[PDB]
mmCIF file of N, CA, C and O in Angstrom:
data_model
loop_
_atom_site.group_PDB
_atom_site.id
_atom_site.type_symbol
_atom_site.label_atom_id
_atom_site.label_comp_id
_atom_site.label_asym_id
_atom_site.label_seq_id
_atom_site.Cartn_x
_atom_site.Cartn_y
_atom_site.Cartn_z
ATOM 1 N N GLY A 1 -0.522 9.709 -31.492
ATOM 2 C CA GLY A 1 0.670 10.344 -32.037
ATOM 3 C C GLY A 1 1.722 9.355 -32.506
ATOM 4 O O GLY A 1 1.625 8.779 -33.591
ATOM 5 N N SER A 2 2.754 9.170 -31.704
ATOM 6 C CA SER A 2 3.952 8.549 -32.248
ATOM 7 C C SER A 2 3.773 7.221 -32.984
ATOM 8 O O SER A 2 2.989 6.367 -32.585
ATOM 9 N N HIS A 3 4.512 7.022 -34.048
ATOM 10 C CA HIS A 3 4.451 5.751 -34.704
ATOM 11 C C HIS A 3 5.703 4.986 -34.463
ATOM 12 O O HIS A 3 5.790 3.854 -34.790
ATOM 13 N N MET A 4 6.667 5.628 -33.847
ATOM 14 C CA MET A 4 7.921 4.999 -33.505
ATOM 15 C C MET A 4 8.481 5.632 -32.236
ATOM 16 O O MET A 4 9.044 6.681 -32.291
ATOM 17 N N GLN A 5 8.279 4.999 -31.088
ATOM 18 C CA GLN A 5 8.876 5.447 -29.840
ATOM 19 C C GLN A 5 9.715 4.345 -29.284
ATOM 20 O O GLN A 5 9.188 3.427 -28.743
ATOM 21 N N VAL A 6 11.018 4.443 -29.431
ATOM 22 C CA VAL A 6 11.885 3.352 -29.123
ATOM 23 C C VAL A 6 12.531 3.497 -27.757
ATOM 24 O O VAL A 6 13.119 4.512 -27.455
ATOM 25 N N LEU A 7 12.395 2.464 -26.947
ATOM 26 C CA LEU A 7 13.041 2.395 -25.628
ATOM 27 C C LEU A 7 14.271 1.484 -25.755
ATOM 28 O O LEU A 7 14.325 0.613 -26.667
ATOM 29 N N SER A 8 15.245 1.708 -24.881
ATOM 30 C CA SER A 8 16.292 0.728 -24.675
ATOM 31 C C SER A 8 15.673 -0.560 -24.085
ATOM 32 O O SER A 8 14.519 -0.582 -23.594
ATOM 33 N N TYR A 9 16.403 -1.639 -24.162
ATOM 34 C CA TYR A 9 15.842 -2.854 -23.684
ATOM 35 C C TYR A 9 15.522 -2.742 -22.204
ATOM 36 O O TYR A 9 14.439 -3.172 -21.748
ATOM 37 N N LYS A 10 16.430 -2.148 -21.438
ATOM 38 C CA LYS A 10 16.133 -2.017 -19.957
ATOM 39 C C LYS A 10 14.898 -1.149 -19.679
ATOM 40 O O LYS A 10 14.041 -1.468 -18.819
ATOM 41 N N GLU A 11 14.767 -0.088 -20.453
ATOM 42 C CA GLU A 11 13.607 0.759 -20.300
ATOM 43 C C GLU A 11 12.364 0.026 -20.687
ATOM 44 O O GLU A 11 11.291 0.195 -20.054
ATOM 45 N N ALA A 12 12.463 -0.761 -21.748
ATOM 46 C CA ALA A 12 11.276 -1.515 -22.168
ATOM 47 C C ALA A 12 10.862 -2.470 -21.058
ATOM 48 O O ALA A 12 9.661 -2.671 -20.780
ATOM 49 N N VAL A 13 11.819 -3.072 -20.410
ATOM 50 C CA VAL A 13 11.483 -3.952 -19.268
ATOM 51 C C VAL A 13 10.846 -3.170 -18.089
ATOM 52 O O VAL A 13 9.855 -3.608 -17.547
ATOM 53 N N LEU A 14 11.423 -2.047 -17.684
ATOM 54 C CA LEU A 14 10.805 -1.259 -16.615
ATOM 55 C C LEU A 14 9.364 -0.803 -16.937
ATOM 56 O O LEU A 14 8.462 -0.837 -16.100
ATOM 57 N N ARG A 15 9.183 -0.445 -18.191
ATOM 58 C CA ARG A 15 7.885 -0.103 -18.680
ATOM 59 C C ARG A 15 6.965 -1.272 -18.657
ATOM 60 O O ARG A 15 5.774 -1.138 -18.291
ATOM 61 N N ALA A 16 7.421 -2.441 -19.071
ATOM 62 C CA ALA A 16 6.549 -3.598 -18.956
ATOM 63 C C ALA A 16 6.183 -3.885 -17.520
ATOM 64 O O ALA A 16 5.067 -4.334 -17.198
ATOM 65 N N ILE A 17 7.137 -3.725 -16.629
ATOM 66 C CA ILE A 17 6.730 -3.982 -15.216
ATOM 67 C C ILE A 17 5.653 -2.995 -14.777
ATOM 68 O O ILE A 17 4.771 -3.337 -14.027
ATOM 69 N N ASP A 18 5.762 -1.752 -15.172
ATOM 70 C CA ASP A 18 4.689 -0.808 -14.878
ATOM 71 C C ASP A 18 3.351 -1.394 -15.302
ATOM 72 O O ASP A 18 2.381 -1.327 -14.549
ATOM 73 N N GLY A 19 3.306 -1.953 -16.509
ATOM 74 C CA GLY A 19 2.124 -2.644 -17.089
ATOM 75 C C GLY A 19 1.663 -3.811 -16.256
ATOM 76 O O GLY A 19 0.429 -4.043 -16.045
ATOM 77 N N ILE A 20 2.643 -4.578 -15.798
ATOM 78 C CA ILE A 20 2.334 -5.756 -15.072
ATOM 79 C C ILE A 20 1.718 -5.384 -13.749
ATOM 80 O O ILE A 20 0.809 -6.050 -13.282
ATOM 81 N N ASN A 21 2.202 -4.306 -13.139
ATOM 82 C CA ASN A 21 1.578 -3.814 -11.884
ATOM 83 C C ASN A 21 0.176 -3.286 -12.108
ATOM 84 O O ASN A 21 -0.727 -3.592 -11.367
ATOM 85 N N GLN A 22 0.003 -2.555 -13.186
ATOM 86 C CA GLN A 22 -1.261 -2.025 -13.549
ATOM 87 C C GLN A 22 -2.345 -3.061 -13.771
ATOM 88 O O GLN A 22 -3.523 -2.795 -13.413
ATOM 89 N N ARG A 23 -1.998 -4.224 -14.336
ATOM 90 C CA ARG A 23 -3.032 -5.213 -14.640
ATOM 91 C C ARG A 23 -3.245 -6.147 -13.464
ATOM 92 O O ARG A 23 -4.149 -6.963 -13.497
ATOM 93 N N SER A 24 -2.380 -6.082 -12.455
ATOM 94 C CA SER A 24 -2.426 -7.064 -11.387
ATOM 95 C C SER A 24 -3.538 -6.714 -10.384
ATOM 96 O O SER A 24 -3.986 -5.568 -10.327
ATOM 97 N N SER A 25 -3.982 -7.679 -9.595
ATOM 98 C CA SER A 25 -4.822 -7.328 -8.444
ATOM 99 C C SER A 25 -4.112 -7.563 -7.096
ATOM 100 O O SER A 25 -4.762 -7.650 -6.048
ATOM 101 N N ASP A 26 -2.788 -7.690 -7.106
ATOM 102 C CA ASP A 26 -2.044 -7.829 -5.847
ATOM 103 C C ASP A 26 -2.131 -6.520 -5.040
ATOM 104 O O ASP A 26 -2.500 -5.468 -5.582
ATOM 105 N N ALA A 27 -1.858 -6.601 -3.745
ATOM 106 C CA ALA A 27 -2.048 -5.415 -2.874
ATOM 107 C C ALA A 27 -0.872 -4.487 -3.144
ATOM 108 O O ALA A 27 -1.054 -3.271 -3.189
ATOM 109 N N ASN A 28 0.316 -5.081 -3.306
ATOM 110 C CA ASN A 28 1.537 -4.300 -3.373
ATOM 111 C C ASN A 28 2.152 -4.135 -4.762
ATOM 112 O O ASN A 28 1.902 -4.906 -5.686
ATOM 113 N N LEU A 29 2.964 -3.109 -4.895
ATOM 114 C CA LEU A 29 3.744 -2.900 -6.082
ATOM 115 C C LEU A 29 4.905 -3.858 -6.124
ATOM 116 O O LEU A 29 5.681 -4.001 -5.148
ATOM 117 N N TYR A 30 5.070 -4.532 -7.279
ATOM 118 C CA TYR A 30 6.290 -5.372 -7.541
ATOM 119 C C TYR A 30 7.294 -4.568 -8.352
ATOM 120 O O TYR A 30 6.932 -3.769 -9.232
ATOM 121 N N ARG A 31 8.552 -4.823 -8.091
ATOM 122 C CA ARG A 31 9.618 -4.068 -8.640
ATOM 123 C C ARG A 31 10.714 -5.008 -9.163
ATOM 124 O O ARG A 31 10.984 -6.031 -8.563
ATOM 125 N N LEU A 32 11.363 -4.622 -10.270
ATOM 126 C CA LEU A 32 12.488 -5.388 -10.839
ATOM 127 C C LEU A 32 13.521 -5.742 -9.797
ATOM 128 O O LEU A 32 13.964 -4.886 -9.025
ATOM 129 N N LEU A 33 13.778 -7.034 -9.704
ATOM 130 C CA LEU A 33 14.724 -7.592 -8.762
ATOM 131 C C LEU A 33 15.993 -7.982 -9.572
ATOM 132 O O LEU A 33 16.971 -7.292 -9.462
ATOM 133 N N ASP A 34 15.957 -9.006 -10.436
ATOM 134 C CA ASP A 34 17.076 -9.322 -11.368
ATOM 135 C C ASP A 34 16.669 -9.525 -12.810
ATOM 136 O O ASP A 34 15.818 -10.403 -13.081
ATOM 137 N N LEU A 35 17.251 -8.723 -13.716
ATOM 138 C CA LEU A 35 17.050 -8.906 -15.168
ATOM 139 C C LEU A 35 18.095 -9.871 -15.746
ATOM 140 O O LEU A 35 19.300 -9.644 -15.627
ATOM 141 N N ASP A 36 17.653 -10.955 -16.385
ATOM 142 C CA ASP A 36 18.642 -11.858 -16.983
ATOM 143 C C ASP A 36 19.386 -11.181 -18.103
ATOM 144 O O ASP A 36 18.793 -10.488 -18.920
ATOM 145 N N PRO A 37 20.700 -11.382 -18.162
ATOM 146 C CA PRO A 37 21.443 -10.802 -19.271
ATOM 147 C C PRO A 37 21.149 -11.551 -20.572
ATOM 148 O O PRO A 37 21.057 -12.755 -20.558
ATOM 149 N N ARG A 38 21.032 -10.849 -21.696
ATOM 150 C CA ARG A 38 21.072 -11.483 -23.020
ATOM 151 C C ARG A 38 21.737 -10.528 -23.954
ATOM 152 O O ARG A 38 21.054 -10.052 -24.875
ATOM 153 N N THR A 39 21.999 -10.963 -26.523
ATOM 154 C CA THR A 39 22.558 -10.017 -27.461
ATOM 155 C C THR A 39 21.529 -9.868 -28.557
ATOM 156 O O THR A 39 20.960 -10.857 -29.028
ATOM 157 N N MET A 40 21.268 -8.642 -28.976
ATOM 158 C CA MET A 40 20.168 -8.437 -29.871
ATOM 159 C C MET A 40 20.531 -8.122 -31.318
ATOM 160 O O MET A 40 21.677 -7.852 -31.658
ATOM 161 N N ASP A 41 19.530 -8.176 -32.176
ATOM 162 C CA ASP A 41 19.788 -8.077 -33.609
ATOM 163 C C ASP A 41 19.658 -6.660 -34.205
ATOM 164 O O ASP A 41 20.183 -6.405 -35.302
ATOM 165 N N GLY A 42 18.934 -5.766 -33.522
ATOM 166 C CA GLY A 42 18.953 -4.358 -33.923
ATOM 167 C C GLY A 42 17.789 -3.808 -34.688
ATOM 168 O O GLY A 42 17.853 -2.711 -35.237
ATOM 169 N N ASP A 43 16.712 -4.559 -34.686
ATOM 170 C CA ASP A 43 15.473 -4.163 -35.262
ATOM 171 C C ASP A 43 14.468 -3.977 -34.098
ATOM 172 O O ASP A 43 14.312 -4.874 -33.266
ATOM 173 N N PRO A 44 13.793 -2.812 -34.037
ATOM 174 C CA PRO A 44 13.039 -2.372 -32.848
ATOM 175 C C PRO A 44 11.602 -2.844 -32.817
ATOM 176 O O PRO A 44 10.922 -2.683 -31.808
ATOM 177 N N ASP A 45 11.127 -3.372 -33.940
ATOM 178 C CA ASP A 45 9.781 -3.816 -34.024
ATOM 179 C C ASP A 45 9.668 -5.323 -33.841
ATOM 180 O O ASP A 45 8.567 -5.857 -33.881
ATOM 181 N N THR A 46 10.784 -6.011 -33.705
ATOM 182 C CA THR A 46 10.679 -7.478 -33.516
ATOM 183 C C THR A 46 10.745 -7.841 -32.000
ATOM 184 O O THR A 46 11.642 -7.336 -31.308
ATOM 185 N N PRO A 47 9.889 -8.787 -31.507
ATOM 186 C CA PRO A 47 10.004 -9.110 -30.061
ATOM 187 C C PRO A 47 11.380 -9.562 -29.570
ATOM 188 O O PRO A 47 12.028 -10.388 -30.193
ATOM 189 N N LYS A 48 11.831 -9.009 -28.434
ATOM 190 C CA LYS A 48 13.085 -9.390 -27.841
ATOM 191 C C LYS A 48 12.768 -10.286 -26.639
ATOM 192 O O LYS A 48 11.957 -9.898 -25.802
ATOM 193 N N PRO A 49 13.434 -11.440 -26.528
ATOM 194 C CA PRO A 49 13.277 -12.209 -25.306
ATOM 195 C C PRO A 49 13.629 -11.452 -24.043
ATOM 196 O O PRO A 49 14.634 -10.723 -24.004
ATOM 197 N N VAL A 50 12.773 -11.584 -23.020
ATOM 198 C CA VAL A 50 13.092 -11.138 -21.662
ATOM 199 C C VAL A 50 12.859 -12.242 -20.605
ATOM 200 O O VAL A 50 11.991 -13.122 -20.738
ATOM 201 N N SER A 51 13.652 -12.220 -19.543
ATOM 202 C CA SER A 51 13.282 -13.011 -18.400
ATOM 203 C C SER A 51 13.906 -12.290 -17.222
ATOM 204 O O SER A 51 14.998 -11.690 -17.350
ATOM 205 N N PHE A 52 13.194 -12.257 -16.100
ATOM 206 C CA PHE A 52 13.631 -11.454 -14.974
ATOM 207 C C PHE A 52 12.777 -11.763 -13.788
ATOM 208 O O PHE A 52 11.699 -12.360 -13.962
ATOM 209 N N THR A 53 13.161 -11.291 -12.599
ATOM 210 C CA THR A 53 12.337 -11.535 -11.430
ATOM 211 C C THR A 53 11.884 -10.175 -10.964
ATOM 212 O O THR A 53 12.536 -9.190 -11.247
ATOM 213 N N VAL A 54 10.727 -10.141 -10.306
ATOM 214 C CA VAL A 54 10.244 -9.008 -9.605
ATOM 215 C C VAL A 54 9.960 -9.436 -8.157
ATOM 216 O O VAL A 54 9.639 -10.595 -7.878
ATOM 217 N N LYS A 55 10.056 -8.477 -7.242
ATOM 218 C CA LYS A 55 9.739 -8.699 -5.851
ATOM 219 C C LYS A 55 8.834 -7.627 -5.291
ATOM 220 O O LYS A 55 8.852 -6.424 -5.701
ATOM 221 N N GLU A 56 7.978 -8.099 -4.394
ATOM 222 C CA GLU A 56 6.956 -7.288 -3.718
ATOM 223 C C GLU A 56 7.654 -6.178 -2.909
ATOM 224 O O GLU A 56 8.700 -6.425 -2.272
ATOM 225 N N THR A 57 7.134 -4.975 -3.036
ATOM 226 C CA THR A 57 7.619 -3.816 -2.234
ATOM 227 C C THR A 57 6.623 -3.478 -1.122
ATOM 228 O O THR A 57 5.579 -4.103 -1.024
ATOM 229 N N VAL A 58 6.947 -2.465 -0.308
ATOM 230 C CA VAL A 58 6.080 -2.024 0.744
ATOM 231 C C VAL A 58 5.036 -1.046 0.232
ATOM 232 O O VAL A 58 4.164 -0.611 0.959
ATOM 233 N N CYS A 59 5.140 -0.671 -1.031
ATOM 234 C CA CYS A 59 4.213 0.257 -1.626
ATOM 235 C C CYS A 59 2.997 -0.473 -2.083
ATOM 236 O O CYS A 59 3.127 -1.599 -2.565
ATOM 237 N N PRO A 60 1.825 0.172 -1.950
ATOM 238 C CA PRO A 60 0.551 -0.203 -2.589
ATOM 239 C C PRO A 60 0.692 -0.300 -4.096
ATOM 240 O O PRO A 60 1.393 0.466 -4.734
ATOM 241 N N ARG A 61 -0.022 -1.236 -4.673
ATOM 242 C CA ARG A 61 0.112 -1.469 -6.091
ATOM 243 C C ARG A 61 -0.143 -0.190 -6.894
ATOM 244 O O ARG A 61 0.498 0.090 -7.935
ATOM 245 N N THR A 62 -1.095 0.613 -6.426
ATOM 246 C CA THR A 62 -1.473 1.819 -7.170
ATOM 247 C C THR A 62 -0.690 3.068 -6.713
ATOM 248 O O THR A 62 -1.036 4.187 -7.112
ATOM 249 N N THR A 63 0.341 2.897 -5.880
ATOM 250 C CA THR A 63 1.158 4.082 -5.452
ATOM 251 C C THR A 63 1.581 4.917 -6.598
ATOM 252 O O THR A 63 1.771 4.434 -7.698
ATOM 253 N N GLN A 64 1.785 6.204 -6.394
ATOM 254 C CA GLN A 64 2.420 6.878 -7.527
ATOM 255 C C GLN A 64 3.853 7.260 -7.238
ATOM 256 O O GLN A 64 4.498 7.894 -8.077
ATOM 257 N N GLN A 65 4.345 6.832 -6.068
ATOM 258 C CA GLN A 65 5.804 6.770 -5.788
ATOM 259 C C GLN A 65 6.513 6.055 -6.934
ATOM 260 O O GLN A 65 6.039 5.028 -7.417
ATOM 261 N N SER A 66 7.662 6.592 -7.354
ATOM 262 C CA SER A 66 8.615 5.876 -8.200
ATOM 263 C C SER A 66 9.064 4.502 -7.619
ATOM 264 O O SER A 66 9.383 4.397 -6.428
ATOM 265 N N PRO A 67 9.091 3.429 -8.454
ATOM 266 C CA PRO A 67 9.394 2.130 -7.877
ATOM 267 C C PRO A 67 10.678 2.139 -7.070
ATOM 268 O O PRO A 67 10.729 1.503 -6.020
ATOM 269 N N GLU A 68 11.671 2.936 -7.489
ATOM 270 C CA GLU A 68 12.958 2.998 -6.803
ATOM 271 C C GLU A 68 12.761 3.516 -5.414
ATOM 272 O O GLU A 68 13.599 3.287 -4.578
ATOM 273 N N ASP A 69 11.671 4.244 -5.177
ATOM 274 C CA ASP A 69 11.316 4.741 -3.826
ATOM 275 C C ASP A 69 10.518 3.725 -3.010
ATOM 276 O O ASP A 69 10.113 3.994 -1.870
ATOM 277 N N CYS A 70 10.310 2.541 -3.581
ATOM 278 C CA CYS A 70 9.542 1.522 -2.886
ATOM 279 C C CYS A 70 10.459 0.424 -2.492
ATOM 280 O O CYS A 70 10.845 -0.411 -3.302
ATOM 281 N N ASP A 71 10.825 0.433 -1.220
ATOM 282 C CA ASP A 71 11.646 -0.608 -0.634
ATOM 283 C C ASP A 71 11.041 -2.010 -0.884
ATOM 284 O O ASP A 71 9.837 -2.161 -0.783
ATOM 285 N N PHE A 72 11.883 -3.003 -1.177
ATOM 286 C CA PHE A 72 11.416 -4.405 -1.185
ATOM 287 C C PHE A 72 10.925 -4.795 0.206
ATOM 288 O O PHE A 72 11.563 -4.475 1.219
ATOM 289 N N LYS A 73 9.774 -5.444 0.276
ATOM 290 C CA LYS A 73 9.318 -6.001 1.546
ATOM 291 C C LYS A 73 10.247 -7.109 1.982
ATOM 292 O O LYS A 73 10.695 -7.939 1.169
ATOM 293 N N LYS A 74 10.532 -7.069 3.282
ATOM 294 C CA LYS A 74 11.120 -8.182 4.004
ATOM 295 C C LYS A 74 10.212 -9.393 3.791
ATOM 296 O O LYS A 74 8.989 -9.333 4.046
ATOM 297 N N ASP A 75 10.840 -10.455 3.280
ATOM 298 C CA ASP A 75 10.216 -11.745 3.028
ATOM 299 C C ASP A 75 9.387 -11.638 1.769
ATOM 300 O O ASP A 75 8.486 -12.434 1.567
ATOM 301 N N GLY A 76 9.652 -10.626 0.949
ATOM 302 C CA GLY A 76 8.717 -10.317 -0.144
ATOM 303 C C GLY A 76 8.614 -11.415 -1.176
ATOM 304 O O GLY A 76 9.626 -12.031 -1.504
ATOM 305 N N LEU A 77 7.398 -11.648 -1.690
ATOM 306 C CA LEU A 77 7.184 -12.561 -2.841
ATOM 307 C C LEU A 77 8.107 -12.168 -3.994
ATOM 308 O O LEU A 77 8.417 -10.992 -4.196
ATOM 309 N N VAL A 78 8.559 -13.168 -4.737
ATOM 310 C CA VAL A 78 9.404 -12.922 -5.883
ATOM 311 C C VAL A 78 8.638 -13.661 -6.933
ATOM 312 O O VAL A 78 8.108 -14.746 -6.641
ATOM 313 N N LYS A 79 8.496 -13.088 -8.126
ATOM 314 C CA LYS A 79 7.830 -13.803 -9.217
ATOM 315 C C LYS A 79 8.835 -13.812 -10.358
ATOM 316 O O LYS A 79 9.506 -12.798 -10.563
ATOM 317 N N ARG A 80 8.928 -14.895 -11.140
ATOM 318 C CA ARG A 80 9.822 -14.867 -12.321
ATOM 319 C C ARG A 80 8.917 -14.605 -13.514
ATOM 320 O O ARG A 80 7.833 -15.202 -13.617
ATOM 321 N N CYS A 81 9.359 -13.699 -14.377
ATOM 322 C CA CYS A 81 8.591 -13.197 -15.508
ATOM 323 C C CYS A 81 9.326 -13.600 -16.770
ATOM 324 O O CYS A 81 10.554 -13.449 -16.888
ATOM 325 N N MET A 82 8.576 -14.119 -17.715
ATOM 326 C CA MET A 82 9.150 -14.594 -18.952
ATOM 327 C C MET A 82 8.300 -14.079 -20.081
ATOM 328 O O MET A 82 7.116 -14.056 -19.930
ATOM 329 N N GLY A 83 8.922 -13.737 -21.225
ATOM 330 C CA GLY A 83 8.178 -13.441 -22.432
ATOM 331 C C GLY A 83 9.014 -12.538 -23.357
ATOM 332 O O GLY A 83 10.196 -12.787 -23.569
ATOM 333 N N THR A 84 8.390 -11.508 -23.907
ATOM 334 C CA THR A 84 9.104 -10.631 -24.795
ATOM 335 C C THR A 84 8.694 -9.211 -24.519
ATOM 336 O O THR A 84 7.571 -8.947 -23.974
ATOM 337 N N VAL A 85 9.590 -8.302 -24.896
ATOM 338 C CA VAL A 85 9.180 -6.886 -24.980
ATOM 339 C C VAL A 85 9.325 -6.483 -26.406
ATOM 340 O O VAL A 85 10.044 -7.140 -27.121
ATOM 341 N N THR A 86 8.679 -5.377 -26.784
ATOM 342 C CA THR A 86 8.927 -4.808 -28.096
ATOM 343 C C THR A 86 9.477 -3.405 -27.847
ATOM 344 O O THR A 86 8.839 -2.604 -27.148
ATOM 345 N N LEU A 87 10.665 -3.144 -28.379
ATOM 346 C CA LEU A 87 11.386 -1.889 -28.075
ATOM 347 C C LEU A 87 10.604 -0.688 -28.539
ATOM 348 O O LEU A 87 10.512 0.323 -27.806
ATOM 349 N N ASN A 88 10.003 -0.832 -29.719
ATOM 350 C CA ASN A 88 9.041 0.174 -30.210
ATOM 351 C C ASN A 88 7.694 0.099 -29.492
ATOM 352 O O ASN A 88 6.850 -0.749 -29.806
ATOM 353 N N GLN A 89 7.506 1.030 -28.558
ATOM 354 C CA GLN A 89 6.361 1.112 -27.688
ATOM 355 C C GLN A 89 5.134 1.520 -28.471
ATOM 356 O O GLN A 89 4.009 1.325 -27.987
ATOM 357 N N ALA A 90 5.356 2.143 -29.641
ATOM 358 C CA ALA A 90 4.309 2.903 -30.399
ATOM 359 C C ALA A 90 3.026 2.069 -30.595
ATOM 360 O O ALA A 90 1.847 2.576 -30.635
ATOM 361 N N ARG A 91 3.298 0.773 -30.692
ATOM 362 C CA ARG A 91 2.326 -0.195 -31.088
ATOM 363 C C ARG A 91 2.792 -1.577 -30.571
ATOM 364 O O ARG A 91 3.997 -1.795 -30.330
ATOM 365 N N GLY A 92 1.824 -2.489 -30.421
ATOM 366 C CA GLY A 92 2.072 -3.795 -29.834
ATOM 367 C C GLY A 92 2.395 -3.573 -28.360
ATOM 368 O O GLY A 92 2.373 -2.420 -27.857
ATOM 369 N N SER A 93 2.657 -4.649 -27.637
ATOM 370 C CA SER A 93 3.178 -4.439 -26.291
ATOM 371 C C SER A 93 3.830 -5.717 -25.867
ATOM 372 O O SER A 93 3.905 -6.687 -26.632
ATOM 373 N N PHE A 94 4.297 -5.693 -24.654
ATOM 374 C CA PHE A 94 5.042 -6.803 -24.147
ATOM 375 C C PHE A 94 4.084 -7.984 -24.012
ATOM 376 O O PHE A 94 2.833 -7.856 -24.040
ATOM 377 N N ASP A 95 4.688 -9.139 -23.925
ATOM 378 C CA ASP A 95 3.978 -10.392 -23.777
ATOM 379 C C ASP A 95 4.730 -11.191 -22.697
ATOM 380 O O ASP A 95 5.721 -11.846 -22.948
ATOM 381 N N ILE A 96 4.300 -11.038 -21.449
ATOM 382 C CA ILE A 96 5.136 -11.480 -20.307
ATOM 383 C C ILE A 96 4.192 -12.093 -19.301
ATOM 384 O O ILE A 96 3.145 -11.579 -19.026
ATOM 385 N N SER A 97 4.573 -13.215 -18.775
ATOM 386 C CA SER A 97 3.824 -13.843 -17.725
ATOM 387 C C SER A 97 4.747 -13.911 -16.521
ATOM 388 O O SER A 97 5.918 -14.316 -16.671
ATOM 389 N N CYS A 98 4.198 -13.501 -15.351
ATOM 390 C CA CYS A 98 4.920 -13.549 -14.067
ATOM 391 C C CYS A 98 4.375 -14.668 -13.194
ATOM 392 O O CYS A 98 3.149 -14.816 -13.097
ATOM 393 N N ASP A 99 5.253 -15.399 -12.521
ATOM 394 C CA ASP A 99 4.799 -16.613 -11.820
ATOM 395 C C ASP A 99 5.635 -16.820 -10.582
ATOM 396 O O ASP A 99 6.851 -17.088 -10.682
ATOM 397 N N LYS A 100 4.968 -16.745 -9.424
ATOM 398 C CA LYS A 100 5.621 -16.986 -8.128
ATOM 399 C C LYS A 100 6.192 -18.431 -8.014
ATOM 400 O O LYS A 100 7.160 -18.670 -7.264
ATOM 401 N N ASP A 101 5.645 -19.362 -8.792
ATOM 402 C CA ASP A 101 6.112 -20.795 -8.718
ATOM 403 C C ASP A 101 7.225 -21.108 -9.680
ATOM 404 O O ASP A 101 7.741 -22.222 -9.681
ATOM 405 N N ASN A 102 7.563 -20.193 -10.584
ATOM 406 C CA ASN A 102 8.672 -20.507 -11.476
ATOM 407 C C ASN A 102 9.929 -20.093 -10.779
ATOM 408 O O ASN A 102 10.272 -18.936 -10.850
ATOM 409 N N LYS A 103 10.633 -21.031 -10.150
ATOM 410 C CA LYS A 103 11.760 -20.685 -9.257
ATOM 411 C C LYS A 103 13.049 -21.309 -9.656
ATOM 412 O O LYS A 103 14.099 -20.676 -9.551
#
């Protein structure tokens, strides 16, 4: 269907994290911890820089609980994620690498 489904930048990031959890083989669900602030140009099909951290929650990676319902684990791993999102979800996708050693 859609050829143009545009998310806000924050939504695009939450959606990418959903993706990142989906492709991962970690036991637990990771959740947005801190999104770095950045200013955009206003075209939805061009990649927007993102960088942010995620932290391990007490939820199983495949939980269907909403991430906001998944408490961060005490002592939880934090990974820093860098790359781009594309606001137009319709096509293309984010390009983000998460790394526990990028601190």
